[PDB]
Amino acid sequence: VVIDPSGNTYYNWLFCITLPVMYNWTMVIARACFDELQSDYLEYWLILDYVSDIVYLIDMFVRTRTGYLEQGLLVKEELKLINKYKSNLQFKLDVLSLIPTDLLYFKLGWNYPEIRLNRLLRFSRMFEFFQRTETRTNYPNIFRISNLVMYIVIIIHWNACVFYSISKAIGFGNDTWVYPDINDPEFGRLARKYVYSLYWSTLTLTTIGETPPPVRDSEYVFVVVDFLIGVLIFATIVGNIGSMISNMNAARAEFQARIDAIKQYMHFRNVSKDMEKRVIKWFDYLWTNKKTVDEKEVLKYLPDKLRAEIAINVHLDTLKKVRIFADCEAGLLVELVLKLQPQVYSPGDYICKKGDIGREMYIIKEGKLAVVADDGVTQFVVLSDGSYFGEISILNIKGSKAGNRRTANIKSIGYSDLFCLSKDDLMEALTEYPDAKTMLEEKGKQILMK
Amino acid sequence: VVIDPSGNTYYNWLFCITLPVMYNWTMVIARACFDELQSDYLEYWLILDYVSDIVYLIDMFVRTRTGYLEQGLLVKEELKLINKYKSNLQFKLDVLSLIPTDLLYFKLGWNYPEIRLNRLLRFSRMFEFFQRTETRTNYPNIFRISNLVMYIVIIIHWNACVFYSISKAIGFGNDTWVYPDINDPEFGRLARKYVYSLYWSTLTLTTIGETPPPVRDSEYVFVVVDFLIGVLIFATIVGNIGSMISNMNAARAEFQARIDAIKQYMHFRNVSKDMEKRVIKWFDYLWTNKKTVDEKEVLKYLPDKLRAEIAINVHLDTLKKVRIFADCEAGLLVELVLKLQPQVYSPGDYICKKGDIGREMYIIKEGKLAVVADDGVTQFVVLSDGSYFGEISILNIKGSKAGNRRTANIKSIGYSDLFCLSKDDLMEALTEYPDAKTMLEEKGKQILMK
Amino acid sequence: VVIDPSGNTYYNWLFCITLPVMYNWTMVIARACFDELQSDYLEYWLILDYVSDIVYLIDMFVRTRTGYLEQGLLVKEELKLINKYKSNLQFKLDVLSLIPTDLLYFKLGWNYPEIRLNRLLRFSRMFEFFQRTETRTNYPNIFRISNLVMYIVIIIHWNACVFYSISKAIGFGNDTWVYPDINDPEFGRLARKYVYSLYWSTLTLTTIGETPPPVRDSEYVFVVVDFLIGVLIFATIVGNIGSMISNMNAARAEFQARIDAIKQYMHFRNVSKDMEKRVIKWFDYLWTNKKTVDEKEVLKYLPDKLRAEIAINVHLDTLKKVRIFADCEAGLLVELVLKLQPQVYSPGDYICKKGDIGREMYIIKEGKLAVVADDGVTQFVVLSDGSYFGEISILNIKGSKAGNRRTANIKSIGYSDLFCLSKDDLMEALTEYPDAKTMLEEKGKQILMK
Amino acid sequence: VVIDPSGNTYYNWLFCITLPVMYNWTMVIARACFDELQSDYLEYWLILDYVSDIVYLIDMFVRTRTGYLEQGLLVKEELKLINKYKSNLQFKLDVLSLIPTDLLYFKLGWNYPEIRLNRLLRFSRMFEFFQRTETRTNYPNIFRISNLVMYIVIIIHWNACVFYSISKAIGFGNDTWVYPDINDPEFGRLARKYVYSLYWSTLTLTTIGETPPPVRDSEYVFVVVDFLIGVLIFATIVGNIGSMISNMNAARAEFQARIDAIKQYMHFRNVSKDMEKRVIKWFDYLWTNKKTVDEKEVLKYLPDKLRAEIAINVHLDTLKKVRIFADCEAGLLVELVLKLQPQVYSPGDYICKKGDIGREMYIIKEGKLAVVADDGVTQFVVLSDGSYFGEISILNIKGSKAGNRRTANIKSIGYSDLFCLSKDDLMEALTEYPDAKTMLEEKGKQILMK
């Protein structure tokens, strides 16, 4: 065997089947409308159509060999897959899109390729590929815009073909509206035919209108309907363009809107230009160093038993340098990684101060912190990455003259990325295995006596 | 009896009255402006107008026979309904729209059907039908787009009629702007008249402008006002189109935006392509198997005493296979169905692990789980649908060497849809009837000894 | 005083000063550009300009006599108000807009009314009136759309005047682009002048372009700049139109989106058409009876000491029929009115059932409820409006064989609007005055014995 | 060293390098396409190009001398900065944009300035400056709109240059579509050349289309592609304009939407016009006095150890007049400034009333309050700014006949801005230093006895 739709093989086949479906959606109508296209390159159209039909057949086979999830397990029983396929509307659409209507080439002649129009009924495969690509691609907005542009181009191409067909029905050159006479040297070339039809279609759907006005009632009606199709469908698609660009700007726009609200508040309250500059510097840091997004709000949509792995694969850089995690229990790190709230501190920010509520443990992910003196400048100890502080005031200790108080003040030399671990959480998670707690308050007593 | 507006009969009548109202809103102005329309098909217009008026009268009768809610009860007293009708502005509008202005046909002649313009004053019924359909239809966006297209078409039709009337007032063919001379063979046909007027209207309201420029001051003024009506009203309607397409994409766009934020985080943090593929697979599963929507956020707008029924009608498939619910008390299932949080687990995800906080009971809705050994591969027990686990570590038990600990580790073979029932909730809800609890810890002791 | 800007007198004056400001913003540029406008109606323009200037002077006086809030109190000291006025930029703008530039009529002649262009510098007053109207009017969206249309019209009018002025500078009729020769009988009329200039302006700003193309470099540059002004500013304004219509649809669109999510869930889960019809009926009820909006989310932006008055003025209809409130303490009703959560129940919905957690007291605002038998049909007692139930299981009672249990089952005959009062809240709020509690458990014992 | 990108020097250099990048992005294509531009002002183009290249070199030097943050510290080691630069793609782009392609002037002649097209590869610097300006400027929306207008102008300019180049390739005047013959006196001027090309570009990108239709297939194709570029890219940019105006209106629109929901509720519930006027007055006050924004929601994105400084720099005006803060401990004010919830009370609003739950302490930021008698009018004490009340009922006091009760009723004479400090918070924060608490209940006893 089976293909496992989640796999890469299924996605690759989705591409390989979208190619014929897109080809069919573009060219069947073109060949049906522009007769010279069908006739001049008939030897190539036959090859391409037969290859497309072969790929359609192989796609039907793949649909027979693609497993589905019952009880969460991939069904691998062949006949079960055949039944699941045939019971779905997709099998009906596939049989309809693979009906050998090409036999009508013997009746209607080689000049009627619209018999292959049923081949469009595999559009679903194409759309599936798109909805898969949009999910799996690393450039979701580039692909989304390319998809919208493809839809625009297909719509304009189809409307060009429709215009040319209507000109044919009315008669080429019978009036100033229809496509001019084919017998003209310049206006008889297939290139000119298609490109002028596309020009007309673009002017009509984009509602520019710089085309000869209608002459007949059918022409007036078609032009009204087509200008309305233009207005509505092009507003739809080119406003989807707008929404895609909006969601492209979503993060940056939200960040900038927050900054603007802050600046409005500061200018209204006449906040000192010192503090205004400090705030602007904080936000410039958040942007430049790519910290505007908070991983919590993003990863909250992941499963906890997958977001856990995510956090581990991101923070194993530091949670191996820490003494508590991955050293004593070697598994405890998972119990708290999904609750280590990542904070960022500016240069000179006092994370801790003597005589404060010690309700948070900190793990230094990045940055240089200092166990300073209360004078403000004298740096007693420099804590680099992997260090952990703020854990002594969490625990119950014998001989602690300072209970629930910070034993020292910790300031940040530079921008520090820390993991604030709350006291309640450390309490709750160390209950399972105190084999790490013993050396934890080993460190605790050792630092509390000195 | 009375009609009970909530019923299907009332909605069917809403359709049957919207038909004449729509007919009146489309055709009265057309016949008033295009005199040949009124004259040539007068025998049909008379029949249709009289049928419309009869339906208007029957709609007034229905309004007299439609109950309203006082004290939440449907008023069935006839005279009370007559008073409620006559006291509402709707009765005034109905009498105004049913005034026999057709008598003016004897004074103004058969060439003045705008006397029936008062018939438009039942627009409310039409709109009511729409606002009912949008609520009750299964295709809300299809109907909404059809409604907007109907508004566009009606506006363009009315503007075409207005253009033709203005041409008539100025005189057909008196200058290049107005509709050409009626005496022309081609430009005198009612078909050509209406269709060219519609063409002009479309070019003006869509602001394409490929029409002969005005000549007189009245023409310049009307064209300015009409181009502005075009800009404003068509932006309104065709931006409502945009918002409707947006809300069509709302679920998919939110899902894809979450996926994009996740992928941005993973690529920025250089998350391993293993875990990136796992996350993409999780999201592909959520989409393909239609799990992107969380029933909680959707059904939270339902009444609890209706959302309860909803959850029952959805989850009675599994809550009959469970041993606790619908078996001992047979009513307890409602006390917890509105708090069974549905979770989804990937293949191989450890739902439970030995030595963890047993604070959640799980009911396997769909999927195969395994009571494995801690080695990781040896599957002791396979739990299929209807099974419940994680309930032993919830309860107070005699002789439990493992208190508040998982007696075994449960992993998911495939994608498991479970119902996580919190410990606090099971505690709170079993307090009412311990007739099920006794066999609950029957199972508990039986599994805790073996 | 003083005038007290919050008062109605200040708003009326805002209108009376917006009239000259709007007049000045519309007509000064018109008279400056269309010389015939200035000249032909000079006797009227002089009167209107002098009246506008008098009103400007009276507006300056009002600004001297309008109090401001210092320490939250309206300043009534005259000289303090004069200082507050003169210290503001508004005084500078007012003196600039009232500078007697009309004296230049003696130097530049009566054909130069753009000397009155400084009169536009009172635009602020106009805008203030708008921002006041939008706040105080009952039709905020009608006024907002009218304001946007006024901006559109003013922009188009100004661009028409600019086009005519540029034609004058280049010379009327010197090329096909500029306004045609004034000496023409038809193209020399002030009506034709202004209306064709407005036509050109509309075609340019709405970017239709059906105007003679530029000839000179200045014309090309102006047309480029004006088409870009068109694109940008008209997108701005006519997209503000879109956002205004969106916020017009905001409530209805949110309601309908909730209904659509519900219907999607129900159709996906194959919810029985019984329950689907019940849900659709619930939502039809919510809409038809105007219950889609929840007063909590709306009134949460009001002050509690004003939202309290709001809730009182709305619910004094029923909280006078209740026995506890406005009867014993006569002031207790305010302590709980801001926490009476309004619920709606469908016909047949069991609000209470025997043997359930009695943690909510209910006050029947509207609707008929029944104290039924557990059989389901036998109605023991019918509770109409003003009745209160679910209070016995809240209180501590002697001789209650049923503790924390519902003494009877309450069902809703029809759609009941109730006030669910939580047990914790009744406990917390009755602590202040048990003078009502005594008769409360009077009723309690009386019903618990029978 | 180093430059410290957060500093003002780096931003100034960002401007000084954006000037050549913008110059290059505007003029290289212009000179490449309009040959007369390159030739006539070659002496000036050479100077400007060499100055631009010198500034590019100095920008490369700056990039070598700009520190980056490792461990949150600004790297000042020269060679480390050289490595960080050369290891980034920016160094590749800078070397590519500074390659001396001007040497090709000796081969291709002075008429080929597109060899300087590589100079566009420093676009990043320009964009960086923009993203810095948008952050640091006080007019974020003005700058954003200016940036979008710059993008529009650059796109139109580039498309004008492209049109002129295509006309050159096809041949000037070979058909009606291309730019006319250069040999024409009027259509040969560089001014006319560029300005008509810009006119064509504006008509095409804004999709007005009032230009001669294409003649050749290449012209038709280019016009189709360019009209589509117009539609898509101009919708993008001029809808970004819409979103920028939306976020300009965001605060005012949210405020007005809240007011509209309130007014809809009040008119639907038939709220008395007294209370409707009171609510409208409250909202008029909120707007006029600039209180629609709540500093909590804005400043919650700031760091707590920066939002603290913000609140201090804003509220030190009053927290120096208070007796508790900045007087006894002199540091306690920071422990509670981030939890002082700012409330606003209308004139006559009873903040406190005798016999109520004293769970909030109030600090009068602005406004006159009264310790009144319960009669309602007799004002015992007038509390101005700096005063604090509601603190007696917070504390545990000996001899308090009124426990957890308000000792008096406090009403607001005028609009009072207060700081509501919750009881729990005062309890929690005074635990650290009771040196202020002693005089706190000094005041407490002193007022409780009298």
Ligand SMILES: Nc1nc2c(ncn2[C@@H]2O[C@@H]3COP(=O)(O)O[C@H]3[C@H]2O)c(=O)[nH]1
């Ligand atoms: N007092 C003290 N604290 C230190 C030293 N080195 C690291 N620390 C950390 O500084 C922290 C300050 O807050 P805590 O008292 O909670 O915990 C303290 C220790 O974790 C040291 O040498 N002396």
Ligand SMILES: Nc1nc2c(ncn2[C@@H]2O[C@@H]3COP(=O)(O)O[C@H]3[C@H]2O)c(=O)[nH]1
């Ligand atoms: N230990 C054990 N647990 C089982 C077995 N079969 C099912 N389970 C479930 O596995 C669950 C693991 O978590 P709990 O200990 O809370 O509850 C356990 C039982 O509900 C079994 O055979 N042995």
Ligand SMILES: Nc1nc2c(ncn2[C@@H]2O[C@@H]3COP(=O)(O)O[C@H]3[C@H]2O)c(=O)[nH]1
């Ligand atoms: N048992 C009983 N309850 C009644 C009667 N009339 C009204 N009620 C209300 O029905 C309510 C059901 O819930 P509670 O027991 O909390 O409170 C009960 C009473 O408030 C009655 O006649 N008998």
Ligand SMILES: Nc1nc2c(ncn2[C@@H]2O[C@@H]3COP(=O)(O)O[C@H]3[C@H]2O)c(=O)[nH]1
């Ligand atoms: N009773 C009384 N209260 C006063 C007086 N002056 C100020 N107050 C304040 O009024 C407040 C009312 O609420 P509290 O009793 O909590 O605290 C009271 C005091 O803080 C006074 O003279 N008498």
Ligand SMILES: [Ca+2]
């Ligand atoms: Ca257009």
Ligand SMILES: [Ca+2]
């Ligand atoms: Ca046009």
